[PDB]
Write a structure and sequence with these properties.
CATH topology of chain A: Histone, subunit A
Number of strands of chain B: 2
Entry title: Structure of mammalian Pol II-DSIF-SPT6-PAF1-TFIIS-hexasome elongation complex
Largest sheet of chain A: none
Keywords: chromatin, rna polymerase II, nucleosome, tfiis, transcription, elongation
Distance between the termini of chain B: 64 Å
CATH superfamily of chain A: Histone, subunit A
CATH architecture of chain A: Orthogonal Bundle
Chain A: Histone H2B
Organism of A: Xenopus laevis
Oligomer: part of a larger assembly
Largest interface: A-B, 62 and 59 residues
Distance between the termini of chain A: 37 Å
PDB class: transcription
Amino acid sequence: KTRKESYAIYVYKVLKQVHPDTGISSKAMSIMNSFVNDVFERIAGEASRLAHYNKRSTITSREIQTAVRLLLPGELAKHAVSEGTKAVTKYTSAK
Amino acid sequence: TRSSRAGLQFPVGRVHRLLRKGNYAERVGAGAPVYLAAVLEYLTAEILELAGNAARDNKKTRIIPRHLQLAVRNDEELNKLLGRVTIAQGGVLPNIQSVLLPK
DNA sequence: CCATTGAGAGCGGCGGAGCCAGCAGGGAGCTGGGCGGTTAAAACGCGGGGGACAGCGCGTACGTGCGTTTAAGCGGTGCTAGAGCTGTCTACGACCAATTGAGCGGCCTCGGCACCGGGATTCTGAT
DNA sequence: ATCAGAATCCCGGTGCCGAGGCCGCTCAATTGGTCGTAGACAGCTCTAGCACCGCTTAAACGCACGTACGCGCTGTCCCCCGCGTTTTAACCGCCCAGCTCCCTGCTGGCTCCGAGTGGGTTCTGCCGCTCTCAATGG
């Protein structure tokens, strides 16, 4: 019985991080999963062209970054770059 | 993991796999699955935030598609982002044009 | 009398034809899904109100023209910033293998919430 | 406004099925590790971008005038509204079909294969490791 993946459990964990005493329906869960994949493509895609445009073979956090700045509206971009630059530095801390 | 090592809830592994396999480039940096998983995590938070709010406002403990729609269409910045997305079972915001109202 | 030990001898091992049994593969029972009966959304009937649309007229803003005024476009010269091309070294990513739990499907119980029948309010139209 | 009068909302009771949770298996992630190359970075040159000027004039500005269009008003006529009845499309009970219960068909296994008779020749496990005897060394 095939092992189909999703983002479901992580959506949940983040839900708890923001609204601890709140739950979700399957129907809305699909929407959250759709949302994630759509956003993932759009950012990944932009990043991809960015590389090409600049005759370079690698999609780095920087490519991802500027992708984000083209894909997102002023404020939402702003925070996104934060969380982005943060988790990256915090990652390069640990090893 | 690496979700840990970056304080993320979002699968930093999963993401690194998907970038390599989804044919975006020849090679794929170490920071990017982290940078992106984060941005993904960030944005799913903002939605879950304002939807939950909306479910409180609409007096329910569980979020249904509507609560997402309300959260989205009422947020000026999110609505743009999902400017071309129809959300299943979203309905519409209530909006009735003036001149249509009784006198 | 004393005594280790070869030799004696004994036991532990090292073709062919024809019935029934077993199995596997393909129809139409009783629980699921498709048709009959009942019943709720749609097509129709009825008729009146207000909105569409056409006519008209007023008031004025926007098109036109001319004279006045401003700065675009031209090509011509001079300066260096920055792009693009170049050249070396190495860090970071891909790739392979081997070990480990994060994440998924499968599981059951339980409670958030769809359902509603009654009473609370918040308007609409008539007066 | 002030009235009743709808239709809608909010409320307390009940009820059921999907949430959200745990059970445990497995496969995707992580680890340790090698190899080489994409791209970082410092060096160097050479394009075109910026700057600045003045001769020329085409374009832009500003104002004057009136024309014909924006729109505000009216006035009529009918197209859609809301209230209601009947036909039809959707939800509950029965009958027929898919999941299911039965037979039909190939192949492996087992048994049998004439009476009697004479003679013949070959074939009853073989090595070896310990216990016992009484010969024979001191």
